[PDB]
Design a protein around this nucleic acid. Structure first.
Lengths: 83, 88, 84, 86, 122
RNA sequence: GGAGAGUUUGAUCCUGGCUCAGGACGAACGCUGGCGGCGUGCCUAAUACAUGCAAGUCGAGCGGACAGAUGGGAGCUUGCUCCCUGAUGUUAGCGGCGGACGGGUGAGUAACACGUGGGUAACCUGCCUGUAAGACUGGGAUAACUCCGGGAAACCGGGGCUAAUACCGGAUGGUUGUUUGAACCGCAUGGUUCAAACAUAAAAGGUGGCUUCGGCUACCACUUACAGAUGGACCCGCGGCGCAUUAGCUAGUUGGUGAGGUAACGGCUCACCAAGGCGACGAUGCGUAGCCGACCUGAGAGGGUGAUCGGCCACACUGGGACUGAGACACGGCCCAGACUCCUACGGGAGGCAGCAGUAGGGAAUCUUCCGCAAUGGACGAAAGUCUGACGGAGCAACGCCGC
RNA sequence: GGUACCUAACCAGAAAGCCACGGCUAACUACGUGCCAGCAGCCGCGGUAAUACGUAGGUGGCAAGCGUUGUCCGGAAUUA
RNA sequence: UUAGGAGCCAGCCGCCGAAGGUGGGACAGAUGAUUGGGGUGAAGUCGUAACAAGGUAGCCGUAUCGGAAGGUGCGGCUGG
């Protein structure tokens, strides 16, 4: 309205791109947790590195804000410790 | 953001100024932390009075003033004493 | 380089039915800002009992911390004196 | 000279007695103009209803369509008595 | 197909909520009224904020009904609530808005201010 | 640093009422009114708003357009027409940061909102310094641009072209997490420090000079880490109201365990299990109202008020959600409904003055639709600069104080 | 904003009012008036000599203001 | 390496979820014919109940009757 139309034209374009980082981060965690219902540790090890690949790059991009991601790390990490 | 700066006081026509360490987010008459002495523009002579020592402790923490405030410190050598500390 | 000491009291326990926690009555008392006489109030809190060594009418100290649950903002220090 | 010669939004000379507010400007044209008047504009700016017109002015009227109506405040906002008898 | 002694959902914010009929203004005795006919009505309920309030003999126009409307195409319009829009005893309404759809068989007569205020002239 | 006076009565003293002299107004009205400084100036309607302005900034982030003529050359009418990219100039869009502050209003809110003192081992902090390190190697787009299509418009859709300090991979990293050791200490959770192992986690160039044409250099920006500076969030004692003709009130209520969730502690959310918690020191409820330094008054103790100026919270037509961003649930941002206004070719859309003014309307009653970024301030930028209804001043009314 | 300001030139020339006047409370007479018209914060004033009404003169009050009005405090030790 | 997987989105689905609708209670205010007392006003009518031993000593509490103040019953009180 006061020439801040340029914000909404970018805010929606960022809203698509940010959620693709966010939703793929969610699928990485469940696939690790899929290997918790599954009785596989070696599959969980390579998935933990696959999950933390997205997690560590997530705070590098935008709002995931590491103090969450530390809880995202260790909660996955004790399950591999549980196996 | 932390700008040591002036602060507008006094009557309508003849202003008065106080040199103030504060945050720029607070308004022109906004709040602050601790002040240094004075400024007088309406005197055709002198009487710009500075504490001359307390701001150097703040400059070692880092607080960038505007140049209209800063050249009063040059007139009393606060910055050049501080630049010696930066050369120290 | 000691950190700042927290809030602390001693007092007296009404009930024990709360799981691993109690209430403790503090009986400090003050004057009124208009007249001068000094009357007593009732100040009770919620305090953590990690050992469940509590009694009805127990003299005990309390120690605040980060809030452990809803309205629970204390833990014990020492069971000072017991009931009969 | 006891009358104001004001102008309508066409530009016709509107002969009204002197001391008129723009509420008095309405009833020379039509009475329902006064029934539907909200505000007024003289020469670019809006003018208040507290304004009294002068001889030789173009007066534009902020007129509602058929929505709005008068109050008790307007009964002494009629300076000229013949318009005040209206 | 609205008779005597039917109850109608009112389609404007002119004050009323539910309206009952008296007589269809046809001839000596007309039984029904599909669309566009003019009823003399009364007001069984009103909004608390009301220009027209409880118990007022009103004259109104049917807009939308559970009746057919045989166009010459063969298309039959049929809504799912009987209704009125209260008018000021003329070819003109007295409300501000008109809630919901309005049947296109009001343009056969000149009720065009209801047409111009309609949100979806179906 | 504490004046009293008239009145019950035929007359007196008490008793007890009201009355009166005083002091302030954000005050209004009546009558009059010469001027100058300094200061205030919608309390009712947080009711609705015509019109203009109130937040943009970087060509030194970047592609292209856009002019340009330093010269070069062309066709001739000597009047021109050009084709190359001069200096340099313009910035729709792109991208970076700001828009969360500055500014207003006083509606809800009787509670950790505020006032005061605290605590955090239970937290966060882009833009600030200072230190520690750095800044490797690639990739795929896409706007603008055009070319069509659909639309009354609002605008929207499709096909190619293209950039970057945009975006996305690979390396290396003292973040963090895991695993296993140590050391020390606190206030239980524990905390702090050190080692090893594993796991990933980056970055960017731009500006000007110097160049061996390989590059180098300062400067700006960049990634990461440490502190300090900086504000913010959460918790806690203690304070400032009216009614008992409001005495019973609450089931996520109150507890535990685990789980999820939040920057963070938590019934904050959910499962389970338990039945507690709140209360005559007045809960719950209801009417009422923003709080505070302070203002006025009193001799003081107190009482009243919470306007302007300064602190903080809350709200942005009414209500609810949410994104990007260090920071909002965003005063001049989006999405949804509710009322209302405006436009429409009826299919559709756009709008939010309790920003400055001004108007309507309300009311006893409150002001100028000015000029200026010169000073102070912010915003961005390397700076000039740009942008500023913050502010600077001018204008109105004896509104008040002082001065003539 | 040639605004403040200062310099020189000019004229008594531009310019005062409202309120009170029995007692509280400083200040009074004359006409009008006759429970009527009207005052009033308090006690209360007028059915023919109204210092209390209205007017005039004259005082007094304060001053670019004065009264009335609604507020809040005080006097009110009358929530002590 | 002529494409599959990963991931992503359109779409639909579920819980939550504001406004809307429905329903019986709470309290707040206007209004309601008529009535019930309560004061408040010019020599209205009816009685005399009080205050004197008030012409029957009054007075509180209860009961009861009458135009109405009141009347007496019973107990209590000196302010008989």
């Amino acid at each position: 309205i006061k020439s801040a139309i340029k914000r909404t034209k970018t805010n929606n374009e960022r809203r698509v791109h940010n959620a693709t980082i966010k939703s793929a981060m969610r699928t990485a965690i469940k696939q690790v947790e899929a290997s918790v219902a599954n009785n596989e540790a070696d599959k969980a090890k390579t998935a933990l590195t696959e999950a933390a690949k997205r997690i560590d790059k997530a705070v590098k991009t935008g709002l995931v804000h590491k103090n969450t991601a530390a809880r995202y790390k260790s909660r996955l990490a004790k399950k591999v410790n549980g196996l | 953001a932390v700008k040591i700066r002036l602060k507008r006081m006094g009557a309508k026509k003849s202003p008065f100024y106080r040199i103030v360490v504060a945050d720029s987010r607070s308004p022109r008459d906004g709040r602050f932390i601790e002040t240094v002495g004075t400024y007088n523009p309406v005197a055709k002579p002198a009487e710009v009075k500075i504490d001359e020592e307390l701001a150097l402790k703040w400059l070692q923490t880092g607080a960038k003033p505007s140049d209209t405030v800063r050249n009063l410190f040059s007139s009393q050598g606060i910055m050049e004493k501080f630049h010696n500390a930066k050369q120290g | 380089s000691e950190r700042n000491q927290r809030k602390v009291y001693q007092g007296r326990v009404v009930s024990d039915k709360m799981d691993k926690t109690i209430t403790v009555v503090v009986e400090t008392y003050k004057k009124h800002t208009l007249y001068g006489k000094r009357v007593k109030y009732s100040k009770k809190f919620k305090a953590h009992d990690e050992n469940n060594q509590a009694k009805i009418g127990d003299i005990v100290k309390i120690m605040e911390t980060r809030p452990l649950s809803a309205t629970k903002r204390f833990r014990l220090v020492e069971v000072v004196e017991e009931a009969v | 000279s006891d009358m104001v010669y004001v102008f309508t939004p066409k530009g016709d000379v509107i002969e009204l007695p002197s001391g008129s507010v723009p509420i008095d400007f309405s009833y020379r044209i039509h009475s329902e103009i006064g029934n539907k008047t909200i505000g007024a504009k003289v020469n670019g700016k809006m003018v208040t209803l507290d304004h009294k017109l002068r001889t030789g002015d173009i007066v534009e009227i902020l007129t509602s369509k058929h929505s709005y109506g008068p109050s008790q405040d307007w009964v002494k906002l009629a300076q000229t008595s013949q318009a005040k008898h209206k | 197909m609205i008779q005597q002694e039917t109850r109608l959902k009112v389609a404007d914010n002119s004050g009323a909520r539910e309206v009952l009929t008296i007589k269809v203004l046809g001839g000596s005795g007309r039984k029904t009224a599909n669309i566009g006919d003019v009823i003399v009505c009364t007001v069984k309920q009103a909004t608390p904020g009301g220009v027209v309030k409880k118990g007022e003999v009103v004259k109104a126009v049917i807009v939308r009904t559970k009746s057919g409307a045989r166009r010459s195409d063969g298309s039959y319009i049929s809504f799912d609530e009987n209704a009125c829009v209260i008018i000021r005893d003329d070819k003109s309404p007295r409300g501000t808005r008109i809630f919901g759809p309005v049947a296109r068989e009001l343009r056969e007569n000149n009720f065009m201010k209801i047409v111009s205020l309609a949100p979806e002239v179906i």
